[PDB]
């Protein structure tokens, strides 16, 4: 569950929009920006930096 929301690597997907998003990088325990295509993303995909930080606070690679 944190597996999907925090440990999953970022997925741009196939659609060609440029949606600025945030993913959690569990190697550094820090939320970073990426660009989402618009389609079929995973759960490690957040609108706001603070939403990312919040959802993934205290999360480490298992």
């Amino acid at each position: 569950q944190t597996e999907d929301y925090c440990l999953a690597s970022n997925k741009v997907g196939r659609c060609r929009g440029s949606f600025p998003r945030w993913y959690y990088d569990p190697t550094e325990q820090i939320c970073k920006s990426f660009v989402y295509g618009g389609c079929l993303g995973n759960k490690n995909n957040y609108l706001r930096e603070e939403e990312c930080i919040l959802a993934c606070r205290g999360v480490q690679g298992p």
């Binding site: 196939r14 659609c15 060609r16 929009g17 440029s18 949606f19 660009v35 618009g38 389609c39 957040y46």
Partner: protein
């Protein structure tokens, strides 16, 4: 656009930039009349607690050249009045990936602001023909957008070839445009923008809408575009254009 060059100022006066609130540029669109734009349906789908389908959330920039000069002379800012996503749009297969955007207030025609021509339903953009893709999207996949509007010359690919490159994924609504070599292609940030085709008297017609791809500019993964001709009537019915 990967592998393109800088566009000349006002070379593509139908190219529009769509900005979502507090997010900057999301998608391209094309000007088709004083009141309407054509774009991709996938740009305007509600997601992660933001209403991308809500017309009030967007700003359109017409006659834009440089994303860092949004207040340059002749750039026209326009709010949206309505968003019509195609009824048959499929968010899993990307079928019917087309949308219509109503400007709140008519565009003012100028040398930088001018509509693109629409093709009749029976018109074919023949395989092998050179056409142009334009946009402020990434110049590499997983890369960064361009401030200056990019243009890239690509070629129409046979449907059978297209089907075979991307098995079980291509519908009659979709068209492969690019090169089997890759190198030149649209990319993230280009969605919803027009394919521009130089026709018999030099006037430019819209061949398609930037939709999707397997990365960008990769070998045997050309860009997939929504065809325009089969939507001519749907466009007329909904807009009067």
């Amino acid at each position: 656009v990967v592998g393109g060059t800088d566009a000349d100022e006002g070379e593509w006066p139908w190219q529009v930039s769509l900005h979502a609130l507090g997010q900057g540029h999301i998608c391209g669109a094309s000007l088709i009349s004083p009141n309407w734009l054509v774009s991709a349906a996938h740009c305007y789908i509600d997601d992660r607690g933001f209403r991308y389908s809500d017309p009030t959330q967007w700003t359109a920039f017409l006659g834009l050249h440089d994303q860092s000069q949004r207040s340059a002379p002749g750039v026209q800012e326009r709010r949206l009045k309505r968003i019509i996503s195609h009824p048959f749009f499929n968010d899993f297969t990307f079928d019917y990936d087309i949308a219509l955007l109503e400007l709140e207030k008519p565009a003012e025609y100028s040398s930088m602001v001018r509509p693109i021509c629409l093709p009749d339903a029976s018109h074919v953009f023949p395989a092998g023909k050179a056409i142009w893709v334009t946009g402020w999207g990434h110049t590499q996949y997983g890369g960064t957008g361009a401030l200056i509007l990019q243009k890239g010359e690509i070629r129409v690919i046979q449907q059978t070839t297209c089907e075979n490159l991307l098995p079980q994924q291509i519908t009659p609504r979709m068209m492969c445009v690019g090169f089997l070599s890759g190198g030149v292609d649209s990319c993230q940030g280009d969605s919803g923008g027009p394919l521009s085709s130089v026709e018999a008297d030099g006037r430019i017609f819209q061949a398609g809408v930037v939709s999707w791809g397997d990365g960008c500019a990769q070998r045997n993964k050309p860009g997939v575009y929504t065809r325009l001709p089969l939507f001519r009537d749907w466009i007329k019915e909904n807009t009067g254009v």
